[PDB]
């Protein structure tokens, strides 16, 4: 409820400046209805050459100044209420990119995209939606207040009595509104998940003919949002009706307090309609205050995502020039944070030498890919230690560690850039000779020349334009372009044919690189120096 005002610091030289064009509005407007009367009373007092032209000139200058202030204020407000939204969006994305992996399995991608694309406008919607009528209204209210200051010594019982009627319901409503103002978001974002699960898997869905199923699910998700919107609008309208109905109590009380004296009928009957008016405007004030506070407070989830701290360990400062490459497991036992109390690894312990090939085999679900992902400091072992050289792996610098240790995963996921922007992913700057060398090293240059624009070919999402083998070759080239010290590859032979597999047999032909390979077909790993077999999460 306060942090967003800390986000309004760089908008400091606009907002108060906008308030300047606020006051230069009313400083004109408070001189508008008087001299305009000087234009109309001269209808009964006709003096054409001198007074009429002077009154017209003064009215024209006053209205010109008022409009010149109002337009500049509107421009400044419309700029600020988009700059705030842009800063909130950028900071939310930078906070979301920092959290741990286990946060991304509890939540869904559509939920986070809907928090990015719908809740930020709800943050930035706290500006007064209708303001021109409000500025005319405040000037009119000030003038009416100044006119009714002539009944001062009997108004001592009026200002105090205007406070406490129907205000005890207000603390109810700002509760019953606010929860609704949260729930619709939790009905919108979940609905925004549905349009994910079709579109991102469209080639799957058309493979089964389930378009009407997804459309039915989307309409079912939309019906709940419609019901929540109708409930919110009905509650607001009912509150407005009950406030306008119960507002007349002070009116009839002051009418009785006026008529008990029988000042005369010309001084009280022609007096009541102006406070009967401005009661509605002070109700408008308190209503816009409550709505603004509710709109600010309706994003506790976005503020929690802003302030959430990950469970990642303290980053390390270590980044030595040399690196031997000896890897050690010391009684490592790991359980996933999403599904605890079911261990996956049950006390693994081995050692990887700098200059020999270690192969790992095991059945489906045995946990080899868990070992590969744990070796890259993506997760944290509950017990035991993972040691690179003589130091723990969590004490290394992030970019240095992920530039020395690289992996080819079970399924490579590609991005929507060019081929050069995908081979050189994660590199700040690299020469074209390195990319060409990595392309020749993975036998990827035979199909680089085939596709149009050479190496600058656009590749769509997840490598849709390429085949599976070409995607595997690009992933291998991406891993090999860094010239690493520890290279973990699992199932790199998933889609490569026999010829490429035979032509890419020995990864350790260089003789100075630590290689870990994971494979299912045991004949492929007959050339490995060391063979490891694990069953149910325990090494045999």
Ligand X SMILES: Nc1ncnc2c1ncn2[C@@H]1O[C@H](COP(=O)(O)OP(=O)(O)OP(=O)(O)O)[C@@H](O)[C@H]1O
What residues are designated binding site for ATP? 362-369
Residue 491 lies near another protein (rule: CB under 8 A): yes
Long-range contacts of 446-455 (CB under 8 A, 24+ apart): 447/473, 448/419, 455/418, 455/419, 455/420
Chain centre distance of CA 334:
32
**DSSP of 219-243:** HHHHHHHHHHHHHHHHHHHHHHHHH
Helix locations, 1-127, DSSP H: 3-6, 12-29, 32-40, 53-96, 101-106, 109-114, 120-123
Does position 493 bind ligand X by CB under 6 A?
Answer: no
Q: Nearer to another protein by C-beta: 351 or 535?
A: 535
For tokens 């006709």, the residue is 46
User: In what helix (H) or strand (E) does residue 250 lie, and over which residues does it extend?
Assistant: helix 248-259
Interface map 335-364 toward ligand X (x if CB under 6 A): -x-xx----x-----------------x-x
Residue ranges in 424-453 that form contacts with another protein under rule CB under 8 A: 425-426, 447, 450, 452
Q: Choose, by CB under 8 A, the member of 13, 49, 153, 209 that binds another protein.
A: 209
Residue 213 near another protein by CB under 8 A: yes
- Pick one of 409, 469, 530, 539: the residue that binds ligand X (CB under 6 A): 469
CA dihedral 456, 460, 465, 466 (to 10 degrees): 70
Q: Show contacts with another protein in window 85-104 (CB under 8 A).
A: 86, 89-90, 93-94, 96-98, 101, 104
Q: Is 57 exposed, middle or buried (0-12, 13-18, 19+ CB in 10 A)?
A: exposed
User: Residue 531: in which H helix or E strand, if any?
Assistant: strand 530-535
CB of 307 to another protein, least distance (A): 19
376 binds another protein (CB under 8 A): yes
Query: Least separation, in Å, of the C-beta of 464 and Mg ion?
Result: 12
**Does residue 192 bind another protein (CB under 8 A)?**
yes
Q: Which of residues 122-181 bind another protein (CB under 8 A)?
A: none
182 binds, among another protein, ligand X, Mg ion, none (CB under 5 to 8 A by kind): none
Distance CA(112)–CA(305), nearest Å, equals 10
Find which of another protein, Mg ion, ligand X, none residue 344 binds, CB within 5 to 8 Å per kind: ligand X
* Smallest distance from another protein to CB 117, Å: 6
**Residue 16 contacts another protein per CB under 8 A:** no
Geometric angle at alpha carbon 524, from 523 and 527, rounded to 5°: 95
56 binds, among ligand X, another protein, Mg ion, none (CB under 5 to 8 A by kind): another protein
Rg (CA), the chain: 36
Q: By the criterion CB under 6 A, which residues form the site for ligand X?
A: 336, 338-339, 344, 362, 364-370, 410, 464-469, 495
Q: By the criterion CB under 5 A, which residues form the site for Mg ion?
A: 368-369
């Amino acid at each position: 409820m306060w942090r967003l005002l800390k986000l309004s610091r760089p908008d400091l030289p606009l907002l108060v400046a906008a308030f300047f064009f606020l006051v230069l509005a009313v400083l004109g407007e408070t001189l508008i209805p008087h001299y305009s009367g000087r234009v109309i009373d001269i209808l009964g007092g006709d003096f054409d050459p001198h007074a009429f032209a002077s009154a017209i000139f003064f009215m024209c200058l006053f209205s010109f100044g008022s409009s010149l202030s109002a337009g500049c204020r509107g421009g400044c407000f419309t700029y600020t209420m988009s700059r705030i939204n842009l800063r909130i969006r950028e900071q939310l994305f930078s906070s979301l990119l920092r959290q741990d992996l286990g946060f991304f399995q509890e939540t869904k991608t559509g939920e986070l995209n809907s928090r990015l694309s719908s809740d930020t406008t709800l943050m930035s919607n706290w500006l007064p939606l209708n303001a021109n009528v409000l500025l005319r209204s405040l000037v009119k209210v000030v003038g009416l207040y100044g006119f009714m200051l002539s009944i001062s010594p009997r108004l001592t019982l009026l200002s105090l009595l205007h406070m406490p009627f129907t205000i005890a319901a207000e603390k109810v409503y700002n509760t019953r509104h606010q929860e609704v103002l949260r729930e619709i978001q939790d009905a919108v974002a979940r609905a925004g998940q549905v349009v994910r699960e079709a579109v991102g898997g469209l080639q799957t869905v058309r493979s089964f003919g389930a378009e009407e199923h997804e459309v039915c699910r989307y309409k079912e998700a939309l019906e709940q949002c419609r019901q929540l919107y109708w409930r919110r609008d009905l509650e607001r309208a009912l509150y407005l009706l009950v406030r306008r109905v119960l507002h007349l109590g002070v009116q009839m009380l002051m009418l009785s307090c006026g008529l008990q004296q029988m000042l005369t009928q010309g001084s009280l009957l022609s007096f009541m309609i102006y406070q009967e008016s401005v009661g509605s405007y002070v109700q408008t004030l308190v209503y816009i205050y409550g709505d603004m506070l509710s709109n600010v407070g309706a994003a506790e989830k976005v503020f929690s995502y802003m302030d959430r701290q990950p469970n990642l360990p303290s980053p390390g400062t270590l980044a030595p020039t040399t690196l031997q490459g000896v890897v050690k497991f010391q009684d490592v036992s790991f359980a996933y944070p999403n599904r605890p109390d079911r261990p996956v690894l049950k006390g693994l312990t081995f050692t990887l030498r700098p200059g020999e090939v270690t192969a790992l085999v095991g059945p489906n679900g045995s946990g080899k890919s868990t070992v590969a992902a744990l070796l890259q400091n993506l997760y944290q072992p509950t017990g035991g230690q993972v040691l690179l050289d003589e130091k723990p792996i969590s004490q290394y610098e992030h970019c240095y560690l992920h530039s020395q240790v690289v992996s080819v995963g079970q399924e490579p996921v590609l991005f929507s850039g060019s081929v050069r922007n995908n081979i050189a992913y994660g590199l700040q700057s690299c020469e074209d000779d390195k990319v060409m060398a990595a392309a020749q090293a993975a036998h990827a240059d035979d199909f680089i020349q085939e596709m149009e624009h050479g190496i600058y070919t656009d590749v769509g999402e997840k490598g849709s334009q390429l085949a599976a083998g070409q995607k595997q070759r690009l992933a291998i080239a991406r891993a090999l372009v860094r010239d690493p010290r520890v290279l973990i590859l699992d199932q790199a032979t998933s889609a490569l044919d026999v010829q490429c597999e035979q032509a890419l047999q020995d990864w350790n032909s260089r003789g100075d690189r630590t290689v870990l390979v994971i494979a299912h077909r045991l004949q492929t790993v007959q050339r490995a120096h060391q063979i490891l077999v694990l069953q149910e999460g325990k090494l045999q």
